[PDB]
Amino acid sequence: SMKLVKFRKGDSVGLRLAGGNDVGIFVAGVLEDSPAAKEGLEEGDQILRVNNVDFTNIIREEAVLFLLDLPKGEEVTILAQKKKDVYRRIVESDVGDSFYIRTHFEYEKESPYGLSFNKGEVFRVVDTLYNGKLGSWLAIRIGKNHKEVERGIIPNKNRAEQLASVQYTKFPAYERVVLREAGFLRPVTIFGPIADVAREKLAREEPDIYQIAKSEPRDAGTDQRGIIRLHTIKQIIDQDKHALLDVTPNAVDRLNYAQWYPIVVFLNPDSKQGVKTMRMRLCPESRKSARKLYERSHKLRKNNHHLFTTTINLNSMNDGWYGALKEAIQQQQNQLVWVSE
């Protein structure tokens, strides 16, 4: 049975909140005498709606700030319901919040209970008011095989967006993500010292599935080696074919932002000599230095590994990498992708 209470606010609404978006916001306690205590509200009640706002799927931090932000002297209306069956079992288990975020900045733990991260890591956030205060989020790291590897504290979004500003992407510090299946053929970026051979090879031998996207003209005073437009890519997606892209790491990030999440394959070199041996076998004409090509891929892995979707280790002695690339691409295509909510 529902309760609908109506009262004026004085200094505070006079409530302590538990739960979160995965279970509901529950009344953890009432300050005595208060107009909210007067109108019936008590421990164990789920807050369903406040004023004109739905509280059934709001994160705990957001609910606290909303009740804080309410003007004193003015009228508050609350839909609630006694659900002691569930509030009691919000105490046995941690359960409160549950949603996923992607990090778009580097953070180093400020405590041994903290969690460090690089760009692109994903987290299940389980508590938006660690220790009943604002400042930290309790969260679980998600990496390989989508498994919960580690649990610990991180900054709340407010501090995060602020910690991230000391790096001036179009991305927010924390973005809300969720798992989806690609309803289209994902563009394919290939990095490493065999990428150019791989792009040409895939397009040449398997033109039915793959297509190279044409580069725009070269910008004056660059390196003498052009960006690709969203229109050029979209038009290739428009005919159930994988767009092969020769683009920079940042273009990949802009592509991630425009929700086109390309399959990003890094072909990891064997050695300097192994690169030459593969060069001699696959493109004996090419004038590109095996030295530079090897240093480029290490520098690129050094600074942009977060953008890698998959990795294939090159064995100079064979061209098994090709067959492995074909399979890696189709594998990635059928994978769930963490997508902006």
């Binding site: 505070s12 006079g14 409530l15 302590r16 953890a28 306690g29 919000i90 941690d94 009943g132 649990r151």
Partner: peptide
């Protein structure tokens, strides 16, 4: 370890 703990008084 890691109990939820009620919010402050709002």
């Amino acid at each position: 370890e890691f109990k939820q703990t009620s919010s402050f008084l709002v």
